[PDB]
């Protein structure tokens, strides 16, 4: 007996095209998404060139329209030079992305004044998301209050961060957040197995107490999102390993295992991979779209999943219970038992759909 | 013709006793204060032992009462273990001091949750001051708002920081700040002369644009305070130089030079070295206390000032116009033309004066 789920949404993926296509491209990354039960992705702007201006966005839009197998929206990235310049294209993007700490990113800002300028100039009705770790979460929340608008915090990984967000929500502040599967299912304890290169990720893997705090505070977590961040094994195992884990193909199996163990409910999962992503990012429904999963099948995660060009996974060896059997996207079979059945270019930019425009006052 | 000023107050000094008395002690540091026209100092808690518990405060109180030549109040320091334990002694301190970044300090906190705990437990009517640089200013402001109280930001040094504080004040938030003379009168341009050891200070010396921004935004600066941070030349010139500059003996001459040049008024100076320190820290008046200065006398700062045990100064070679001629403290001549005339132990803990207790609701 299969369970039918709606089309799941991953609001934080790195698809590497343009400019990093040996790591992933739209075609391979969206195949990975479909195999993970994900029918819509929001792609981050830290590509080469980075998506920080209208010409770069135009290029990325066409590459995505030609290569994507599932539907998508593309983030713009904040830079030290582009505040006040994105108004004409802002509504065509998933949202604006701010990189506020050291990570794999033309995009670190050098002053909180630059954060303020973005919060003041980006249209008030459109999403802003931040890579903001530890005290940076409190700092960006302050900027959001000074400019009287909301913010969404990416990949929350620490007890400190989730408790700060919890306190902010208790004061009625407009903040939402997401958590990635590696911060729920891996910890410092796994660094011995992973090694120092493979284990590199931002935010870094947390302590057992960090992981426990995220689970205990599930009510504070609005979304799950993979932060799918593919790099090849050669890069991860080399002399200056880039941070990041691939995750599209493993996220849903890990979370379904947790559902089966009673750690959260199926509804809790669907709020975090469907309803809350829709409402925070104003993403449209996908007609005749659904995912069928098998909750009984036990398997062990292999050394690499079939689709991502990363060709490795930090979850190797973990036992999971839960499998994606079939995905239907807009009336076409997109995935069955390991076979992707829609071509590159089947996917569409949801921000171009009438129902995908973000409503605003005249 | 001498100008009579009220007794000036320095709310940020490091007097090194207990435990660092080769760098400074209460007797030498308060001699330096008097020679700088300062009749009351607030001493920071990053001593050895640090002033983070009742027994350490009791020790420091007696050492100060025995050694100080001018009046004083002593800060308590926040630690990772003392939130909720300081209630009985809090009112006897200048305030609570939080070290939120790397500097010469049992006192860095490891989580914003620890900041919140201090803001929640320290009595609401008593001062909290923070060493908070760059984005940390925004972060601690967020904590202050979440806990609905004020905060004072120590040694503001950057355009970024003063503009953030300016924005917060424009939104009516209860934040005050101070600026140290080295951040008004030295910059990156001086590092060639100072060298990498002597030049070490936290916050670091800023760019010419940082210095210009502080002057342009003088209206945002509530207090001047030296951050007198004495270390010996051997330490500053050695293999792991500690950060900090001595400053009590040079602060007023530097600022009087600026007054003479029309960069700020005498009133602007007295607001920042007398009235605002009094009102932010609830410090009492000192009866029959005043300072006589000579605004005409030009001199060049020597390689060391007479009193501080630091026995060096980063302002060596600067030309100043303005000299402290005489200081009277509580009816006794305390300083004349280079001679301190009150003994160690003349100074008193102002928090023990009836008028020095901070008013609170029953
Ligand atoms: N998280 C990572 O470790 N890496 C991400 C960047 C990011 O989400 O910050 C990447 O693009 O490789
Ligand atoms: N500012 C410094 O560079 N040093 C101060 C510490 C401080 O005020 O942070 C010290 O105590 O030496
Ligand atoms: Zn990130
Ligand atoms: Zn995100
Ligand atoms: Zn990311
Ligand atoms: Zn909407
Ligand atoms: Zn400091
Ligand atoms: Zn201070
Ligand atoms: Zn200090
Ligand atoms: Zn008062």
Curated annotation (Swiss-Prot), chains A, B:
Residue positions binding (S)-dihydroorotate: 16, 46, 202, 231, 243
Induction: Transcriptionally repressed following hypoxia by HIF1A.
Effect of residue 12 to N: Abolishes dihydroorotase activity
Post-translational modification N6-carboxylysine, affected residues: 97
Effect caused by changing residue 227 to N: Abolishes dihydroorotase activity
Reported effect, residue 131 to A: Abolishes dihydroorotase activity
Active site: 227
Binding positions (Zn(2+) 1): 12, 14, 97, 227
Subcellular locations according to the entry: Cytoplasm; Nucleus
Domain of life: Eukaryota
Binding-site list for Zn(2+) 2: 12, 154, 178
Effect of residue 53 to N: No change in catalytic activity
Effect the entry attributes to changing residue 104 to A: Abolishes dihydroorotase activity
Function: Multifunctional protein that encodes the first 3 enzymatic activities of the de novo pyrimidine pathway: carbamoylphosphate synthetase (CPSase; EC 6.3.5.5), aspartate transcarbamylase (ATCase; EC 2.1.3.2) and dihydroorotase (DHOase; EC 3.5.2.3). The CPSase-function is accomplished in 2 steps, by a glutamine-dependent amidotransferase activity (GATase) that binds and cleaves glutamine to produce ammonia, followed by an ammonium-dependent carbamoyl phosphate synthetase, which reacts with the ammonia, hydrogencarbonate and ATP to form carbamoyl phosphate.
Subunit structure: Homohexamer. Interacts with CIPC.
Family: In the N-terminal section; belongs to the CarA family. In the 2nd section; belongs to the CarB family.
Protein name as it appears in the record: Multifunctional protein CAD
Source organism of this protein record: Homo sapiens
Residue window of the full protein shown: 1460 to 1821 of 2225
